[PDB]
């Protein structure tokens, strides 16, 4: 009941995507959701915007990537890698909902600067954020401002007056 | 015999007559070795006991008692802002010393 | 229940190879299949069929327990190709090409499969960050790509591939496990100690979770050295078919050709050019056409290949070298004249290309690499000149030389940490500094944020400390309205603070102690950055 | 076979990977000399700082 | 004055601040964890004084 989709080789393509999105929402660790994209794509069902946003929801709302913990987890980077897989690779383009999921995480992560990048990028794409998140970004900014946490501390300390391979930390 | 001619049936040929020859092994003290239709089945003590023994040998080689088993994986520190506000410039040094102690001490 | 089928007895054995004598006449053996040789009542020596003859005899490649082989031993036949275990359970292991694990201190996959046909593979769209600026900018490597690494002995052939394996790790811990690129390091004919050091390197940087190592040392049989890279690609099969990504690193393929020569000549095949049998092109063709970026119908998986070929006296006229340049898309030519001449990695850009180009690399890297190509094409024409117009030097003669300094590395560089060093060059912010301080600059540009220190913080977000701007840079690009002005209002302050506080102090040094101290600092900056 | 390894570790005839030191908790998690292991249980810093061992065993 | 109150609260319960459960699972030997804990206290003392 929709415009039939085609691959780059003009082959007809499946659209019956619902049964896979449910497997994303039923997930508990947000690495299995990507695997659902894989098992979906093998079946000649390529992902659509709704599916990627389901994955960004499951990312934002899940606790950890895998059952065991992992060093180097960044809840933001996975979400912002899906958008590169979306825009460039697959040709699909995100929407206001997608960037909304993205900005919520930077609020939760407390990283107030990357938020402002997202705030500007939205409106450069016509998207408009929810002020509930914009104000929380500014709140985290003001807190980190007054507290001296505006930057990390290791940047706000003097450098070696004398050149020495050890002092600079290399 | 039963196994012999049953193996002869499983072969692609069975119309050919079957001639049986029985010989003696000093190496084998239990079981037999049978060849029919260029198909051999070995059920001998030298083979069976060594087959069961191989499992024990492999299991012994796998284990390393001298070694220490790996600990559970550790997540990122994610230190709180209150810690950092108390100790701005020091947490980096302390994490480095923690790595040093985890390796040496 | 399970009766093994016998086909003949061992007739002859010449080192790594053997000749079978068939028992009966109506018995028939297949081709390329594995056979077994009852070296004892307990153990079995695997093998492989390489010839069949009018006499019924079989030319056989041996792979295990060769020393226990005799003449007259009973020979059995599986009637199946050579296979190995495959799966995610193999990651984090060193493995014999027969699948046997090498200690330290269900599923089966075919070793020889047909390649992805012309419909079952997508063109190259996405990159593979090897970590080096020349290879990310000017020789863009992509996924589903196969790019050779040429070079004379001891030039950095092994290290480019290892650094690729080490660059991917940080990302893979951040991104999902579908877009992470795993790795396989195949060591054909190498020394067992080199393999140990590689294992320990990857284990230090924790790149061993996402790497397996297929070891076929020099003492190993030639047939095993022959089928090693097939074992590697055989593991890549599953990650293709499981929609994942994977990287291959075929350490010297020349050593995989000596083994095929050994086999074929000892089995009395006719020699050919440089004593090879002749069909050694088809060998690497079979191996390397298996690389592909698979269609979305097939999971949008991939496997990149970084084959390595040793070179003698910087010639590209040897047989196997030409046979591989013919096959591989691009090539990373490493010149000993440049390795010896100071710069490391010793990439020679005139002879190193990539037949994919912008389509592989990133939106943010397209606009910089397209500038560096123009700049280096212009610097290629002038840099032969000993600089006479010291103040009349063209801007290209400046920017190009500083970019060459930036090309000097030891380890991989993070994407965010690479562009921002190259953007300054192409746009000329790093023109007042001298060549020798081009990397200390970069160090401070990437690891000691000056405006955050000296109070000149007007930028709302753009600072190099966070390290999470890589994803915004990657998506939006640098030539974007939200990122261009903040970028310039970070670098111009970095330049002014450098030129005023640091550069000034540097040129005021006259003593030998202090100048030697400053000397060694810049070499350290060339290594770590 | 493992009890034999334990006895060899207690005697000190065998060594551990990456120069791991012998301790009761260490050993327990792997799995006169025994009394010394009992001393090894207690924290070294606690003993030295508080002089618990100064009085005697 | 907030910073002074925070320093006092931290000195009263240094261990609470750090994740005790995580550290215990992570460290093979309790002694290593103890040493880490001892250093933080001296840092706070030298800071306030
Ligand atoms: N970018 C680099 N910076 C510093 N040192 C390097 C760099 N690249 C290579 N080297 C050094 O060059 C030496 C050899 O590198 P590599 O092991 O890659 O050689 P190779 O190409 O494998 O030659 P061979 O196979 O004959 O060993 C090593 O000491 C290595 O550290
Ligand atoms: Mg090498």
Spell out the SS3 assignment of chain B. CHHHHHHHHHCCCCCCCCCCCCCCCCCCCCEEEEEECCEEEEEEHHHHHHHHHHHHHHHHHHCCCCCCCCCCCCCCCCCCHHHHHHCCCCHHHHHHHHHHHHHCC
Give the length of chain E. Answer: 49
Tell me how far the alpha carbon of residue C194 lies from the centroid of ligand 2, in angstroms: 9
Task: Provide the 8-state DSSP code for A155.
Answer: T
C218 φ/ψ sector (left φ>0, alpha ψ -120 to 50, else beta): alpha
- Based on the number of CB atoms within 10 Å of its own CB, is C353 exposed (0-12), middle (13-18) or buried (19 or more)? middle
Contacts of residue E9, Cβ cutoff 8 Å, sequence gap at least 6: none
Is the distance from the beta carbon of residue C142 to the nearest atom of ligand 1 less than 6 Å? Answer: no
Helix H or strand E segment including C83: strand C83-85
Tell me which chains share at least 3 CB pairs under 8 Å with chain D: B, E
Task: Dump the DSSP string for C247-297.
Answer: EEEE--SHHHHHHHHHHHHHTT----GGG--STHHHHHHHHHTT-EEE-GG
Give the length of chain D. Answer: 57
Task: Dump the DSSP string for C379-408.
Answer: HHHHTTS----TTT--HHHHHHHHHHHHH-
- Residue C213 neighbours by CB distance under 10 Å: 22
Q: How far is CA C157 from the centre of its chain?
A: 8
Do C355 and C465 contact (CB within 8 A), yes or no? no
Do C254 and C312 contact (CB within 8 A), yes or no? no
Is the distance from the beta carbon of residue C156 to the nearest atom of ligand 1 less than 6 Å? Answer: yes
A10 φ/ψ sector (left φ>0, alpha ψ -120 to 50, else beta): left
Task: Tell me the torsion sign for CA atoms C285, C291, C294, C298.
Answer: positive
Tell me which chains share at least 3 CB pairs under 8 Å with chain E: B, D
Do C344 and C439 contact (CB within 8 A), yes or no? no
Task: Provide the 8-state DSSP code for C500.
Answer: I
Interface check for D43 against chain E (CB to CB < 8 A): the answer is yes
Chain E positions in Cβ-Cβ contact with residue D43 (cut-off 8 Å):
30-31, 34
How many angstroms away from the CA of C105 is the closest CA of chain B? 9
Which stretches of chain A are assigned E, i.e. beta strand?
5-6, 12-13
How many angstroms away from the CA of B37 is the closest CA of chain C? 9
Atom 20 of ligand 1, residue of closest alpha carbon: C154
Here the tokens at position C335 are 């010149």
Distance CA C434, CA B80 (A): 42
Q: How far is CA B96 from the centre of its chain?
A: 40
Do D40 and D23 contact (CB within 8 A), yes or no? yes
Reported as half-sphere exposure (CB side, CA atoms, 13 A), residue B62 has a value of 7
Here the tokens at position C135 are 């290879």
Interface check for E28 against chain B (CB to CB < 8 A): the answer is yes
Check B66 against D29: CB less than 8 A apart: no
Q: Among candidates C279, C346, C309, C338, which has minimal Cα distance to C132?
A: C346
What are the residues facing C267 on neighbouring strands?
none
Here the tokens at position C78 are 């599986």
Helix, strand, or coil (residue C334): strand
Determination approach: cryo-EM
Instruction: Write a three-state SS string for C345-370.
Output: CCECCCCCECCCHHHCCCHHHHHHHH
CB nearest A113 (choices: C174, C466, C482): C466
Q: Among candidates C518, C521, C498, C504, which has minimal Cα distance to C450?
A: C498
Q: Among candidates C302, C297, C4, which has minimal Cα distance to A8?
A: C297
Chain E positions in Cβ-Cβ contact with residue D45 (cut-off 8 Å):
31, 34-35, 38
Here the tokens at position A97 are 């909902």
For chain C, the farthest-separated pair of C-alpha atoms sits apart, in whole angstroms, at 92
Distance CA C271, CA E40 (A): 73
- Based on the number of CB atoms within 10 Å of its own CB, is C347 exposed (0-12), middle (13-18) or buried (19 or more)? buried
Contacts of residue B17, Cβ cutoff 8 Å, sequence gap at least 6: none
How many domains, chain E? 1
Angle at E13 between CA E7 and CA E15, to 5 degrees: 115
Distance CA C101, CA C108 (A): 15
Distance CA C356, CA C377 (A): 19
Looking up tokens 């825009």 gives A87
Instruction: Write a three-state SS string for B34-58.
Output: EEECCEEEEEEHHHHHHHHHHHHHH
Range of the domain at E1: 1-49
Q: Resolution limit in angstroms? A: 3.0
Atom 23 of ligand 1, residue of closest alpha carbon: C154
CB nearest B41 (choices: C3, C7, C103): C3
Here the tokens at position A11 are 């082959």
Check D30 against B60: CB less than 8 A apart: no
Substitution target in C174, C437, C449 with the highest count of A β-carbons within 10 Å is C174
Helix, strand and coil percent figures for chain C, each rounded to 5: 40, 20, 40
What are the residues facing B43 on neighbouring strands?
B32
- Residue C377 neighbours by CB distance under 10 Å: 12
Check C6 against B54: CB less than 8 A apart: no
Annotated active-site residue C143? The verdict is no
- Residue C46 neighbours by CB distance under 10 Å: 18
Angle at C327 between CA C32 and CA C86, to 5 degrees: 45
Chain C positions in Cβ-Cβ contact with residue A39 (cut-off 8 Å):
243
Helix, strand, or coil (residue C159): helix
Helix, strand, or coil (residue C378): helix
Task: Dump the DSSP string for C86-118.
Answer: -SGGGTT-EE-TTS-B------EEESS-PPP-T
C34 φ/ψ sector (left φ>0, alpha ψ -120 to 50, else beta): beta
Helix, strand, or coil (residue C25): coil
Distance CA C468, CA C414 (A): 11
Dihedral through CA C45, CA C50, CA C54, CA C57, nearest 10? -10
CATH of the domain spanning C83-355: 3.40.50.300
Is the distance from the beta carbon of residue C151 to the nearest atom of ligand 1 less than 6 Å? Answer: yes
Distance CA C358, CA C369 (A): 8
User: Which ligand is nearest the CA of C160, by number?
Assistant: 1
Number of H helices and number of E strands within chain A?
A: 7, 2
- Residue C325 neighbours by CB distance under 10 Å: 15
Instruction: Write a three-state SS string for A52-87.
Output: HHHHHHHHHHCCCCCCCCCCCCCHHHHHHHHHHHHH
Q: Among candidates C406, C491, C508, which has minimal Cα distance to C450?
A: C491
CATH 3.40.50.300 in chain C, residues? 83-355
* Closest-CA residue of chain B to A155: B89
Check E43 against B72: CB less than 8 A apart: no
Atom 4 of ligand 1, residue of closest alpha carbon: C410
């Amino acid at each position: 009941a929709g415009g039939k989709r085609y691959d780059l080789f003009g082959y007809e393509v499946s659209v019956a995507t619902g049964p896979f999105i449910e497997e994303i929402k039923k997930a508990q660790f947000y690495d299995d959701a990507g695997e659902v994209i894989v098992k979906m794509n093998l079946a000649n069902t390529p992902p659509d915007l709704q599916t990627y946003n389901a994955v960004l929801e499951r990312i934002l709302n899940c606790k950890s990537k895998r059952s065991q913990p992992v060093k180097g987890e960044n809840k933001f980077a996975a979400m912002m890698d899906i958008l590169e897989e979306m825009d460039a690779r697959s040709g699909i383009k995100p929407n206001a909902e997608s960037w909304g999921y993205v900005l919520k995480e930077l609020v939760q992560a407390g990283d107030f600067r990357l938020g402002w990048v997202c705030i500007a990028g939205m409106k450069s794409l016509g998207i408009t954020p929810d002020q509930a998140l914009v104000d929380a970004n500014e709140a985290n900014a003001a807190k980190a401002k007054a507290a001296g946490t505006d930057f990390p501390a290791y940047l706000k300390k003097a450098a070696p007056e004398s050149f020495d391979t050890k002092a600079w930390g290399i | 015999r039963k196994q012999v001619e049953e193996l002869h049936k499983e072969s692609p040929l069975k119309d050919y007559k079957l001639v049986l020859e029985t010989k003696v092994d000093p190496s084998i003290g239990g079981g037999y070795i049978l060849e029919v239709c260029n198909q051999v089945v070995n059920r001998s003590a030298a083979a069976a006991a060594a087959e069961t023994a191989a499992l024990a040998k492999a299991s012994a080689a796998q284990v390393d008692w001298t070694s220490l088993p790996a600990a559970p994986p550790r997540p990122s520190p994610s230190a709180p802002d209150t810690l950092i506000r108390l100790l701005g410039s020091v947490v980096d040094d302390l994490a480095d010393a923690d790595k040093v102690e985890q390796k040496y001490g | 229940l399970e009766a093994k089928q016998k086909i003949g007895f061992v007739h002859g054995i010449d080192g790594t190879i053997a000749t079978i004598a068939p028992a009966a006449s109506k018995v028939t053996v297949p081709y390329n299949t594995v056979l077994e040789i009852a070296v004892s009542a307990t153990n079995i020596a695997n093998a492989l069929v390489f010839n069949l003859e009018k006499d019924g005899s079989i030319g056989v490649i041996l792979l295990d327990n060769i020393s226990e082989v005799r003449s007259g031993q009973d020979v059995y036949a599986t009637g199946s190709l050579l296979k190995i275990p495959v799966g995610f359970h193999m990651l984090g292991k060193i493995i014999n090409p027969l699948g046997k694990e090498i200690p330290t201190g269900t599923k089966l996959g075919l070793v020889e499969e047909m390649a992805p046909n012309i419909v079952s593979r997508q063109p190259v769209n996405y990159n593979l960050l090897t970590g080096y600026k020349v290879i990310d900018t000017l020789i863009p490597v992509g996924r589903g790509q196969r790019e050779l690494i040429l070079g004379d002995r001891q030039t950095g052939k092994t290290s480019i591939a290892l650094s690729t394996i080490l660059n991917q790790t940080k990302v893979n811990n951040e991104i999902l496990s579908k877009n992470n690129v795993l790795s396989v390091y195949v060591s054909i004919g190498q020394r067992c100690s080199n393999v140990a050091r590689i294992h320990r390197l990857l284990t230090e940087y924790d790149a061993m979770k996402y790497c397996t190592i297929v070891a076929a040392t020099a003492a190993d049989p030639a047939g095993l050295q022959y089928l090693a890279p097939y074992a590697g690609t055989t593991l890549g099969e599953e990650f293709r078919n499981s929609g994942r990504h994977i990287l291959l690193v075929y350490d010297d393929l020349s050593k995989q050709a000596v083994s095929y020569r050994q086999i074929s000549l000892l089995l009395r095949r006719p020699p050919g050019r440089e004593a090879y049998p002749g069909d050694v092109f088809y060998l690497h063709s079979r191996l390397l056409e298996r690389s592909a970026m698979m269609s979305p119908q097939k999971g949008s998986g991939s496997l990149t290949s970084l084959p390595i070929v040793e070179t003698l006296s910087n010639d590209v006229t040897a047989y196997i070298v030409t046979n591989v340049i013919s096959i591989t898309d691009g090539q990373i030519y490493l010149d000993a004249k440049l390795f010896t001449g100071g710069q490391r990695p010793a990439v020679n850009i005139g002879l190193s290309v990539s037949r994919v180009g912008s389509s592989a690399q990133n939106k943010a890297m397209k606009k910089v690499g397209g500038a560096l190509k123009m700049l280096m094409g212009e610097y290629r024409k002038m840099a032969g000149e000993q600089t006479s117009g010291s103040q009349n030097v063209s801007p290209v003669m400046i920017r190009g030389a500083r970019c060459l300094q930036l090309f000097n590395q030891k380890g991989p560089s993070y994407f965010m940490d690479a562009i921002v060093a190259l953007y300054a060059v192409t746009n000329g912010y790093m023109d007042d500094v001298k060549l020798q301080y081009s990397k200390f600059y970069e160090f401070l540009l990437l690891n000691k944020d000056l405006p955050v220190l000296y109070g000149q913080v007007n930028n709302k977000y753009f600072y190099m400390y966070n390290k999470n701007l890589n994803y915004f840079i990657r998506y939006f690009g640098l030539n974007h309205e939200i990122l261009e002005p903040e970028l310039k209002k970070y670098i111009e302050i970095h330049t002014n603070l450098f030129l005023d506080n640091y550069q000034s102090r540097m040129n005021e040094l006259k003593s030998d102690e202090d100048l030697v101290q400053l000397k060694n600092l810049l070499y350290a900056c060339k290594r770590t950055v | 076979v493992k009890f034999q390894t334990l006895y060899n570790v207690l005697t000190g005839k065998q060594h551990l990977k990456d120069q791991v030191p012998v301790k009761d908790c260490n050993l327990t998690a792997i799995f006169l000399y025994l009394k010394r292991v009992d001393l090894t249980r207690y924290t070294r810093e606690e003993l030295t700082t508080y002089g618990i061992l100064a009085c005697g065993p | 004055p907030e910073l002074k109150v925070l320093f006092k609260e931290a000195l009263l319960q240094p261990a609470k601040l750090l994740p005790l459960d995580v550290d215990y699972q992570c460290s093979h030997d309790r002694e290593v964890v103890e040493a880490k804990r001892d250093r933080y206290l001296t840092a706070l003392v030298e800071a306030e004084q």
